[PDB]
Ligand binder design. Sequence first.
Ligand SMILES: Nc1ncnc2c1ncn2[C@@H]1O[C@H](COP(=O)(O)OP(=O)(O)O)[C@@H](O)[C@H]1O
Ligand code: BEF
Ligand SMILES: [Mg+2]
Lengths: 765, 58, 412, 224, 52, 113
Amino acid sequence: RTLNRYEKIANDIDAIRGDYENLSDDALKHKTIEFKERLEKGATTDDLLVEAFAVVREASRRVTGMFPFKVQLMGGVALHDGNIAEMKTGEGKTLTSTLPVYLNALTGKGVHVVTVNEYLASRDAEQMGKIFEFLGLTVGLNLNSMSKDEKREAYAADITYSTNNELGFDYLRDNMVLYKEQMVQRPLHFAVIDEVDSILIDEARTPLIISGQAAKSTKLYVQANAFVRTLKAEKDYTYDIKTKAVQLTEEGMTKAEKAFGIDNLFDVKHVALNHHINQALKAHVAMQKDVDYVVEDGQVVIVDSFTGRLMKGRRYSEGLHQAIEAKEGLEIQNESMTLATITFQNYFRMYEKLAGMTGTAKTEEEEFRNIYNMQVVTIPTNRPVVRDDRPDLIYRTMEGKFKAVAEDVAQRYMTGQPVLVGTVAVETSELISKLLKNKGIPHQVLNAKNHEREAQIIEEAGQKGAVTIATNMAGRGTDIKLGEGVKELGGLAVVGTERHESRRIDNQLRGRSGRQGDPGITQFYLSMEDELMRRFGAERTMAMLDRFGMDDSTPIQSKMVSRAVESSQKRVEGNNFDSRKQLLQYDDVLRQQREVIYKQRFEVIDSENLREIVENMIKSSLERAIAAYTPREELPEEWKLDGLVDLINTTYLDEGALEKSDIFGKEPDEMLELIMDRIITKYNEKEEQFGKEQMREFEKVIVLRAVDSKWMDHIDAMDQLRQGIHLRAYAQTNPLREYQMEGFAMFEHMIESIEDEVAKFVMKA
Amino acid sequence: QRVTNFFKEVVRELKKVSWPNRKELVNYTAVVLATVAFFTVFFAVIDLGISQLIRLVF
Amino acid sequence: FRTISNFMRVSDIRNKIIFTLLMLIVFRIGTFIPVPSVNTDVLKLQDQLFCGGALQNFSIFAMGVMPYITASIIVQLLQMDVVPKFAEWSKQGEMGRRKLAQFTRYFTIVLGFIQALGMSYGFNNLAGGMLIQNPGIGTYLLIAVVLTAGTAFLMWLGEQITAKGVGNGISIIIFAGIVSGIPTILNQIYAQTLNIVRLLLVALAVVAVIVGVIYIQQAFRKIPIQYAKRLEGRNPVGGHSTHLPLKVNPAGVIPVIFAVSFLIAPPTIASFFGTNDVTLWIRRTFDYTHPVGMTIYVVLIIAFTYFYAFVQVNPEQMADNLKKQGGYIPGIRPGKNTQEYVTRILYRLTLVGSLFLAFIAVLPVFFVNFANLPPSAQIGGTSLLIVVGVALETMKQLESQLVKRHYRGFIK
Amino acid sequence: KGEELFTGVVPILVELDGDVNGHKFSVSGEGEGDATYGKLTLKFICTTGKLPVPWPTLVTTFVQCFSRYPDHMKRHDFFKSAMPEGYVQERTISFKDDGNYKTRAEVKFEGDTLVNRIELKGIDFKEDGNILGHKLEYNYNSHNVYITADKQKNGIKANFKIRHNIEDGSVQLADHYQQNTPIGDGPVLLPDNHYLSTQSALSKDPNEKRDHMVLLEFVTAAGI
Amino acid sequence: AKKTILFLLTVLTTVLVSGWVVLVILKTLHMFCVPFLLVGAFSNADGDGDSP
Amino acid sequence: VALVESGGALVQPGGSLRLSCAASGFPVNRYSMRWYRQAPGKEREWVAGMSSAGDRSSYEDSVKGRFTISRDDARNTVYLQMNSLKPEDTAVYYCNVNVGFEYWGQGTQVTVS
Ligand SMILES: Nc1ncnc2c1ncn2[C@@H]1O[C@H](COP(=O)(O)OP(=O)(O)O)[C@@H](O)[C@H]1O
Ligand code: BEF
Ligand SMILES: [Mg+2]
C-alpha cells in the first residue's frame, strides 16, 4: 500500500520542517539557485524531493500564511509520481498543486497548470504567482485574448497557468505555421491538471476544431426560415424528446415539395435544399433561445454545457450557426471549413508525464486505468466532514418545485443564513430570480451574461443574508469564503434545483458548502416533469406518476420514484461512457495519421536545404506515373509510350525535351533513371538561377501550401467516411476494421496527390 | 404468368451485385486452402505427438 | 509468399498468433483426457461392432461449445417481439448488452447441463446397458458437472482468444473442431485404396465448390445512402461514398440447423412413441438421405432462410433507425417506402442466397452417393461454409493490423 | 443586392453582329460566369464563317460584372448597381496606325441570363494593315482597366490601353475609351478611381470541327 | 402471430436439445453433433461541431 | 516560368554592356521574348523583342540601329546590349515573355551619369 509510503514521506517533510523555520530571507531564493545547480550534477527529481517540499512549505508560511497540512504533502508526492490524487472538495488542493510544480520546474523545461475556465485560472495564477515569485521563478498567465507574442512570452516562463481550450488551440495553431519563430509552445514536458474528471471524462467527448471562413450563401437560409416558420408544429414535424432531433412527416414533405415548386424533395439534385430545411428545423425547434445560446450585439454566442460559460470564438458547424443567425434576422456571415482536428485524449497523451488532482474521480478509476495509464490514489481528509446533505425532495410539475424552493430560500433568508441557489440552464435562473422579485429578497444573479462582476459577487456571497442564484459557473471550482458571524448558524446552505448529467457534477455542487470542516446544509429539489426525467426516464413508471395526485404542497414519498431517478441518471452516464469510448477508438486512427503528417510538416519547416526532399518526392511520383503506364501484366511493345511522353513533357519536363524514340521500349527502371537524370540537371539549372535561398523559400511555400490544402480535404473526407462507417456496420463485420482500411487507402491517395502536386508545381515554375 | 417479370427483376438485381473480381477471388482461394492445409497438418502432427506421449507414459 | 513472412516481423501479432496456437494446443490436448468413467475401449469396439471427438474419447468436453451457440441463438430470437424485458435490455445501451451477455452465460450453464444429461443418456442407449459403471440417476451428476465444466472452460478459452489471441475465439474453436475431424477422414480416404480419376475429380469438385462459396459469400449489394445533415459542399474525391451493404446470404448457417431440428424431431417423437408401422414409415420417409425427404429438406431450408433473413436484417426497424438519424435512399421517402424498397431487395437477395444454401446443404449426400465415399466424410456441408467464413474474417483482421503497422510518410 | 443574389453560376449568352469595310460578321456563344471566384468560362462559336478581324481584336468587345471582390471594395462597385436592371456600354477603340471601332452593346439580364448584344461598326480602315491582314498571335495579355465615374451623365468612363502580340514580333497598342450606362435608375453607385486587374487565356477544343474561340478569363479589382 | 412461430422455433431448439432421448446410427449422430453452426455475430449496434 | 535578369551597372554613355535575362522552366526556342524598360516617373514601355526563334527582330525607334537582342538555346537566356547609350535611357529594364500567362522580370536598374 503506497499510502504508508506517502505518510512516511510526509513525516520526513515534518522532520525537515522542524529545522527549516529559523532560516532568514534571501536564502530561499538562494536555495532555489542551489537546487538548480545541484540538479544537473547527478541528482534526479526524487532525490531532491524532501528539501524542496520543505522549502516550499516554508515559503508558503512566509508569504501567504497558509501552512500546508500533512495530507497536502501526501497529495503533492502523489502528484509527483504521475498518479491522480483524488482529494475531497474544499480540502485546499491549490497548495497541493504548488508543491510538484515547484519540484518539476527546476529542470527548466516548462510546467503547464491546466484548469477548466478563465476566472479560476486567473485566481490561481495570481495567488501562486505571489507564492512563486518569492522563490525566484517566472509565472506566466495564459489568456484567451492575448497576442501571439504575449502567448510566446507566457509559454517562455517556468509555469504557465492556462485553460484547456487555450492549450489545445495553441498546439493546434502551432502546426499551421509558415515559419519557426512564429511557434508559440515549448517542447511538452508536464501537465498538472485540476478537475481531471471534467476535462478528461466530461468534456473529453467534444473534439477541438479550428476553422477558417469559406464562401457565403444566403438565399437558402432565409427561405428555409420562412418555410419552417409556416409549419403548424406538431402535425407537420415530429420531435422526439429522447434525443434532440426533428424530422418532417409525410404531410410536411408534401408541403415542402409544394412550397419550393420542386417535384421530389429527396432527389440527389436537391440535397442542398433538404439539408438547409433540416438544419433550419433543428435550429428552430431543438435549440431553445436562452438554454443553448444568447444574443450579443447582433452576434450569436453559444453557451458551453460543461463549464457553463460562453465562449466568444466558437460558432457551430454544418451551417447550424447560420440558421440560428437567420432565426433572429441577424447578419448572416461566412461558412466554416475545417482546418485541423484533435481530441483532448490524444493531446494530453502526448504530454509524456502528467498527473492531476480532482474531487470525485473514484467512480472512473477503471477508465483512468485503461486510457491514460494512471491510478487513483485516495487521500484522507485531516478533519471529519460535517457537510450534512439531506435526501432529495422529488415533486410534481415544475412550478410546484419553484414554489417550494422559493419558500425554502425565503425561510432561510429571514434567518441570516447565506444560500447559494444552483441552477443548470441560463433562463431558468432568471425565472427563479423574477420569482424572487416578489417577497422582496435582494440577490445577485450569476448568469452567463452577468459574468463580468463575478469576483465581487463571489466574495460578497459569504456575508450575512447573501442570496446568490448561480448557474454552472459556480459548479466546478468556485471557492466561497465564509465571512463574519456565519459559522455560528451553519453557513452556506447550498440548494440545487436539478439533477445534473452525472453524479460527479452535482456531487461537486453539493461539496461546494463543506470548506474545511465547516457546517453546511445541502438540499436538492427535483421535478417529475424535469428535463432529465422527461429525456431519459423509463416508460414503465410514467403511468405511475398520475397515481400520486396533484396538489404539490408536499413532496412524494416513494422508493419507486427514487429508483427511477437513479436508473435514469445511470442510463445517462452509460450513454456518455459509450459515446466517449466510441469517439476515442474512432479518433485513434486519425491520431496515427495526424502525428505522421505533423511530423513531416515540422521536418520540412526547419531544413537548411531540403533539395533531397523535393528530389525524392519528384522521383517517387515520377516512378509511380511510370508504373501507372506501362504495366507489368500486359506485354512489352504495346505500352503506348506516346501518352507517357506527352505526360512527361507537359507535367514533369518541359515541352521540347522528349519523344518516343528516346526510350521506345526499354526497361522501366533505367528509363525512369534517365528521366531522373534530366530532371536533376533541370533542377540544378533552377537552383543555380534562383540561388541557394530564394529557391528554398519558394519550394517551402509550395510544399506547405499544398500540404495544408490536401490535409484539409483529407480530414473533411475522413469525417464524411466516419458517419458512413457507423451506417456500414450491417453486414456482419465490425466497422472499425473497415474504417481503418478505408482510412489507410484514403491516406495513400492523399500522399500520392501531395507528391504529384509538389512535382508539377516545382518543375513548371 | 406473374413470375416472368419477377425473375427478370431477380436477374436485373443480380446484375447490380458487386461481385469480387478474379484476382481477389484467386487470392482468397489460395488463403483459405493454405490455412486449411496448415491447420490439418498441424493437427495431425500434434495428435500423433500426444499419441506418442500417452503411449510412452502408459 | 511474403505476406506470411511479414507477420513474424511484427512482434505483437506474432505474439498473439503464437498464443492462439498455444490455446489451440490446450484445446486439442483436452479432448484426449476423459471423464473418470467411460469404458472407452468398449466404445471403440462398439463403433466397429465427423463427430470423432467423443467417438475416440468421450472427453471432458465432448459436448463442446454447441450449448453456447444454441443459447445465443435462443436469446437472439428472444430479443424480437416475444418479451418486453429483453427488448428494453437490448435498447438500453451497452450496459444492457453486458447483462445480456451474463444472462447468456447463465443460460449456457443450464442448457449445457440439460443437454449433457440428454447426450449422456442417448450415448448410453447406443452403448446398451453398460457405458457407465453402475448406471443410475445419481451417477449423472458427475458427468453433467464435468461436461458443464468443459463447456465453461471452453467459453473462457474463447474469451481469452477474443482478448489476446487473433480473432473471434468461439469461431476459432469450431474451426479447430472441423479441421481436427479432417485428417481422420483423410486417413480413411488413403486407406480406401477408380484410383486416381475419382481423386482428381473430387479435388476439382472441392476447388470448384469452394470457389463458388467464396464467390457467393463475399458479394455485397450496395444501397446508396446520402446523409442530410452532412454538407458535402467542398471538393470531393468521390471514390468511397456512404452506402449500405446487404449480404447475398444474409443468414449464414442458422437455417440448416433449424431445418435439421424440424426434420429430426418427428423421428424423436416416433422413438418416444414406441413401435408402429407408422413409426417405421415416418423414419423411412423423413430421411434426407433418401430422395423422398430431400424435397422437404430443401423447402424447409428455403422457408427458414426467408424467416431468418427477415429477422436478421429486420427491415422495419432498419428503416426506422435510418429515418431517426438523417439520411435516406435517394428518390425514396424515409417512411414506409424505404421499408418497401429494402424489402423487395431483400426478397430477391434471399431468393438467390436460398438456392445457394440449399445446393450447399444437398451437396454431401450427392457426393457420398456419386463418389464411392465413406459415409462419415460429409465434405461440402455446413463445415465448408464456417471454415471459409472464419478463415476470411481472420485473414482480414490480420491484414487490418498489418496495414495499421504500415505507414509511409512523404519524406521516405 | 441584385448581383449579390447571383453569387452562384450565371449563364452567359453572347450575340455579336458587325460590319468592317462592308464585310459581314456574326459570332455567338455561351458559357458561365462566377462572382465569388470571379471567372468566366465561355465557349464561343463563329456562326457566320470566317473572321474579318481576328479574335484578339474581338475579346475586349466580348460582361464586366463578374469580378471577384474582397471584403473592402464591396461598397465601391458600379456594376452591381445597374444590375439586374440592365447595362449599356459603347466604346471608341482607336487602333494606332489603323482606324477605329465604334462598338455598340447592351449587356443585360434578359430573363435570367446575361446577354451581351453587340453590334460593332469598324470604320476608317485600310485593309492592308495588320488587323485585316490577320497578323495576330492566338493569345491575349494581362491588363489593368482604369475605372472612373462621371456625374453629368452619372455613369462610368473607363480608360485603358491594350497590347496585341503581332505575329511579326511587334505589338498593337490600342486604346479603349469606354462609356457605361444604366438602364434602370435605382440606387446608383459611383466610386472613385479603381482598376480591374484582368488576365485571360485563349485555347481550342480538339473534338470540335469549325473555327471556334474558347475563352477563359479571370477578373480581380483593386485600388479601393 | 409471428410471436407464436418464434416461440415454436425456440422450443424446437429445446427439442434439438432434448432430441438425445433416442430409444443408420452414425447418420443420426451426424445429424446431432456434426453440423456445428456458427454464431452470426448479430448486433454491432451503435452533440455538434465547434469552431475556434 | 520566373524570369531572372542581370547585367545592370552604373554606365558611361560611351561604353557598351550586355543585359542578360535568364528563362527558367520553359524553352527559349519557341516563344517571343520582349524587353521593356521603365524609368522612375515614366510609364513602362516596350523597347525591343524578337519572335520566330530569332530570325526576324524588331526594335523601337529610339534605339533602332543601336540595340540588338541576342539569345542562346544552350544557356536558355537572352542578351540585350547597351551600345551607344544616352542618359535619356536611364531606366529599370524588364524582360517579358507570354507563355499562357504573362511573366515579368524583377527589373534591372541602370543609371547613367
Ligand atoms: N493550510 C491551510 N491553512 C489555512 N487555510 C487553507 C489551507 N489550505 C487551504 N486553505 C483554504 O482552503 C481553501 C480551499 O481552496 P481551494 O484549494 O481552491 O479549493 P479546492 O481544495 O477544492 O481546490 C482556500 O481558499 C484556502 O483559503
Ligand atoms: F477543489 Be477546490 F475547492 F478549488
Ligand atoms: Mg479546486
